[model samples]
Target: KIRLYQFLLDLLRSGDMKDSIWWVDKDKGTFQFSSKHKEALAHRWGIQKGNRKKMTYQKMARALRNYGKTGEVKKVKKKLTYQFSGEVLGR
Candidate 1:
């Protein structure tokens, strides 16, 4: 039942995906996925969603793009980077 943003927040909190797949900048409330492990991260996302079809980074990025429209997440100019809103960050 986890939402995408909530899943990302949990990853940041746990640091479970650090180094290998993704990393976070807590100060900036931002995170980026490693291009090398982008697919792996997408697979993990699918596991979280309990989806039968494999999740691809392309699909995940689409979701993130939609989140951007709501100001819940914003895309960073840098590759594979995104920032959370202040409200979400509670800062």
Candidate 2:
């Protein structure tokens, strides 16, 4: 069984949720999770975790930040963008 965290990493790495998530600053291991698909991602996590109510974007983000705090996972930053890729950013 794949760990949920690693599964999320794979999703980003495989460009699966390219629209809803992706790396922002790969050098810093930074990523973005679009709020537009929060419910969808949370639902997926819920199914994987077998507890829908307990699985939420806020909770997950907090967990992610906590992992960063402990240096246990790649760093991330939640973001909302009109486009996921294909243009110079923050210019």
Candidate 3:
């Protein structure tokens, strides 16, 4: 199973995700889901996870918050923004 952080990294590396969906600031190790496309990104994540019910951005954000607990990722003050931990970036 793919973890959310890994999934995000995959998306970044693939360069297939549109800027309207999400974008990365490699220098700052930050990424943000576009406000207009938040649900679309969550929907894509649902597909990736094979979720029975449609995935909601709220749930996805909760999961990200959990990751923040361990510093795998940290929530940025900006809306829909997050920063990857150095350990994650080291990969």
Candidate 4:
């Protein structure tokens, strides 16, 4: 039930995600998830999703990026509702 944008926001707020992932521009809907520990983060995503083999940050990032391209992803200044939307979440 968790959306990819929601996942990204949750990680950002967690503070622990700072080293591997961080906001580039919230208003611009940009963020960076470093490749340094990509496997580590991907593993984290896998755990969160309940499928270790199916979750990867690359797929997640692609979802966010595609959403941004289509303007389906809106940036909000709220605490919990804010999220990267999707065309990626479409398929």
Q: How far in Å is the alpha carbon of 41 misplaced in model 4?
A: 1.7
State the lDDT of candidate 3 residue by residue for 9-87, as single tens digits: 7887787767634555887789888777778778889999999999988998889999878999899888888999889
lDDT for position 70 in model 4: 56
lDDT of model 1 at position 81: 91
Give me the overall lDDT of model 3.
0.83
Instruction: List runs of model 3 lying over 4 Å from the truth.
Output: none
Question: What shift in Å separates residue 52 of candidate 1 from its native position after superposition?
Answer: 2.5
Q: How do all models score by TM-score? A: 0.89, 0.64, 0.88, 0.59
Ten consecutive residues with minimal summed lDDT in candidate 2? Answer: 81-90
In order, what lDDT does every prediction score?
A: 0.82, 0.58, 0.83, 0.60
For model 4, the local distance difference test gives 0.60
Q: Residues 54-87, candidate 4: write the lDDT tens digits.
A: 7666676556556555565544454212245444
Instruction: Rank candidates, lDDT, best first.
Output: 3, 1, 4, 2
What are the candidates' C-alpha RMSDs?
A: 1.8, 7.8, 1.5, 7.8
lDDT of 1 by residue, 1-91 (tens): 9888878878877878775345467777888888887787788999889998999999988998998888888999989899999888883
lDDT of 3 at 39: 83
Error of 1 at 75 (Å): 0.3
